[model samples]
Target chain A: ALAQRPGSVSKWVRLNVGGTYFLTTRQTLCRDPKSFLYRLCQADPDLDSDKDETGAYLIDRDPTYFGPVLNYLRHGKLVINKDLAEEGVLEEAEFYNITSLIKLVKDKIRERDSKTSQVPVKHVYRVLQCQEEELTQMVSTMSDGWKFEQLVSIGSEDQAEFLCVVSKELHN
Target chain B: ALAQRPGSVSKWVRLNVGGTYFLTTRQTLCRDPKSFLYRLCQADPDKDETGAYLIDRDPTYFGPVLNYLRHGKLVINKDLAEEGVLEEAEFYNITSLIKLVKDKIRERDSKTSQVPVKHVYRVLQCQEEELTQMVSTMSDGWKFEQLVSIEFLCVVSKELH
Candidate 1:
């Protein structure tokens, strides 16, 4: 379904068949995703981008990527992850599901080491977790308009055309 | 105004004895803060209650004390200095700010053979400039309400009262 992305798509997208996106969304397998590093790769786009670990967009502003990046910048981090991307990444993008992806990835990343990675050690994570709390309160206080739309349409299981668009977008 | 603050005020805050805060706030001075080591002892409950730097509350967390303890469960080389020694004990905890401090100390410690301590020349004006940007960004993002209120009441003019 992902490989047959037949449409115009942004250049900043990729299809990760070996990554956690496939593990969480399509495999029909249930797991804690503790070792699911690819999601962390997504949430930590800045560090991940620098390393070119999984994939990342440049620092230059762009909505699809930068919106979430800036959102993470302003807020501590978003909860965008493969589970949310399971419904198809288009759904992930439409609702700005990146926040959820970021959160899930953050959680999974934390569970992976608890306190190992340079990203967040115990003391840093303590600060980061505190920052996350404060940031959440601040961002939520912002009007609903600023609140990202998580679901664009209320329909059946999913949209074939929308999925195609999403797949195409991811493929790019 | 200076007379209002007690003599103990200097011990209370580093910014009082040295004009670093005023100069930094006004963009007048340029020097490495860590190289100018000041002991951090005691906590002012009236201040951050959680122990924040006289400069910024955010700067004090996971400081030299915590960093020396090894912050992460699995520490890396960046967390350790030469021979895994925490050469510069004054800086750490604050990510962006500490990085600059550590770099300066490392430079001096590593190249001390030619450059004497008095001759170790480095101007942190550019880094000092970054403080405003970093603080504003942190302030703009989150209030840290209680700490901000305390800092405001202490740092700002009496007119704010």
Candidate 2:
């Protein structure tokens, strides 16, 4: 009953989660019917409904994890970057009871865990530059879990170049 | 026109580090003054102007650095590598953090087997009155677990199964 009207449920919806703000539409949130957000899109009481200064709904959840969930809602496909874990997506999908989304994430995890498209040679090439104080401290920390393919160190006290490999499993 | 609408600078700020997002207040960002975040509050049309302050760097290590600004204390998770966190601290020019982390590095290396194996830490504030009655019961058994403050009262409790 005012100028703030765009749609009955507000066509453009903004959300704040895990300290990040997201701009989407109410239509996108209500896409997957019979979900938590589908109910949330209805409306809130004016007095105690939580919102930020920009008038976005406040959701307390992991910012990184929520991104994947939002993407799945936007598009039916489940895609994640190398930096993100599929297990995380599954957990959030399970949290909101998007029963269908859960299956896709589990399908991906089992494929990576057992199906295995992994290249045998783990080309883990890392260039670490450090002062002498750091060099002396490295042997035990790095060597404990990892086996070196080639331990190359060439420099005096002040500076050094470090070249090394990991794991005894691969003879690289 | 003064170029940009100063009023558009709301109290709330949204940040994206690497692929992660953070919601914080402009007050917290400006706490230390002239740091990277302070300058960022103005505007950055160059790097990432896609609605939020997006920085293409590792986001995992930035939490403790941002938390330090909020509470003026340096409480970090035991899980994170100290050197990794120190790099972020150094990059943000948090001078106080540089010294604290360096001290922690030396302190950690000075002992290994001597380090207590079973422990977890959670940060809490307020002890003068609110926690007074609870402490009197624990005023007996609770050892001086730590000496950190923001009024950052560091209290230690043992786990009981």
Candidate 3:
């Protein structure tokens, strides 16, 4: 009765990741022979690995983020959702040492980042002596991607100047 | 041997959502005395010898339901399809969850609503122009089912109440 791992386990496996259990194919988990999950396949089930009462290997990791990693290993595609925002999907990819997943996850992170937390915009207010012609000169200095956001008022009792608010937008 | 039913019901609980596996405790599942999940533990429940329950539902949505019952907070991600969770909440009769998800839905669907209750009409023996003419009798979201000898055309939908 010594601890030893017999070679070539079954095609299906179960993992108890942080209390939640997941069922997947052994081939999907061990796709990359050098990955840590593959090493899990190498461990002796009886003694070396800690198992739950129902016979699932205990993985003391965040079960929530593991879905992205599990799904990606199942198929080479990146999927994001509410659980996708918990800041470490890329971290999971890093922990597991998935080279391609890092780049793909980084790409998706920025995509949603742009969609949800869009980049900040800039605005400016200008006042000029009222002695000139139309507000054409006001717009003359305005650069590309800049537009009017407010109505210009010509009436300021005892004051002889044009007042306007302009917003600057940069499309990169 | 693994855990057996120690009490009238086991303290440990598990669920098979759709085809995925999850583990929890009977204590959490039995909360909210008026909810449908509470009734699950009452009787007529499916269980493995290990005291795991089998529910063919979306685990992605079930996670929120389980966590909501665990704690009072409801946390849904912006892109996680709030309606899917909302449906699960409604199915489980978790009013707190239903309210939270309903509010989240109002924000997400600023441009849309009524996601699942769809209205699909199986137009039988009808022409394009006549179809358009026939559709005029019904209001918006109404579709043609079929016309009787001279009675009336019934309205139909795949949506549930």
Candidate 4:
């Protein structure tokens, strides 16, 4: 019975991803025949030889990112940690040629960025040193949104000095 | 300067989706030029003939798709299930939107259907708490069988008596 069941033979394949060991089955990785990960297990001599000889496959990729990818392949669901950046997931998705996952993560990242990228404020500071006369004219010419203030005198001089502060909001 | 700027003159475009009208920018729909909706707008002679391009998709679902294209966000909390939106996404060839819709569908499916079977357990000669604990620990595949007890009289001490 054991000899007749080939699935039982290769059902649980141990994988070493970047020094981290993971236990999975061929059924998960080979779910999509067109994907690179699937083709690698099928055609790559190194992976095939490793699996054939030691019953374990070695892949050089971030194990952290691979966790979600494996979960996706197994359950058709993407479970991601909030601390993990989606860019790393996208990289793995692109490398594996899981076009669906790539698109999903890409959209997720875009949505996140757009949600947080709204209406950035650029604060511009300008320092002008002028006589007290020009300060009065400057304050008069300034718009209502601008703030004007006088700084402490750096030097003891007859000319009264003043400082003007202005801010503008820019949206991108 | 206004005329020299490309797309500025016709930046705002109207879309007649199913029968309802929507006002949006051409840039939003054309964000992904390869998308079906974008190409449809470009090749549609109706724009030249009738000004606003007409789309045959569901107007209700089209709102979300257009909102996603404009803001790169999906309103997942809405009462409408993602299955219908997914169909609209597929028709429009919006790959990103389709992926998100699929994710929501998977999430919804996963969150549902784990409810326990409704039945009151019957027990015999055991503390109610202990029986409840035992039943709780058992898998859902466990089958309950009624316990039967029989009392028999013995003749060990009646031989000489």
User: Judged by DockQ, which candidate is best?
Assistant: 2
Q: Rank the candidates by TM-score, best first.
A: 3, 2, 4, 1
For every prediction, compared with the true complex, DockQ reads: 0.01, 0.06, 0.05, 0.01
Candidate 1, lDDT over the whole model: 0.27
Model 1: per-residue lDDT, tens digit, B1-161? 01122232222222221111210111101122233322333222322442223443232222222222211211222332432223223332333344545565577566555443232222122242242343234321122111121112111111110
Best candidate according to TM-score = 3
Global CA lDDT computed for model 2: 0.60
- TM-scores for all candidates? 0.16, 0.37, 0.42, 0.32
Candidate 4 structure, TM-score to reference: 0.32
Which lDDT tens digits does candidate 4 get at residues B68-120?
77557665324455777888888988887888988878877865655554544
**lDDT of each candidate versus the true structure:** 0.27, 0.60, 0.60, 0.57
For lDDT, candidate 3 versus 4, the one ahead is 3
TM-score of chain A of 3: 0.58
**Candidate 2: Cα lDDT at A26:** 70
Descending-DockQ candidate ranking: 2, 3, 1, 4
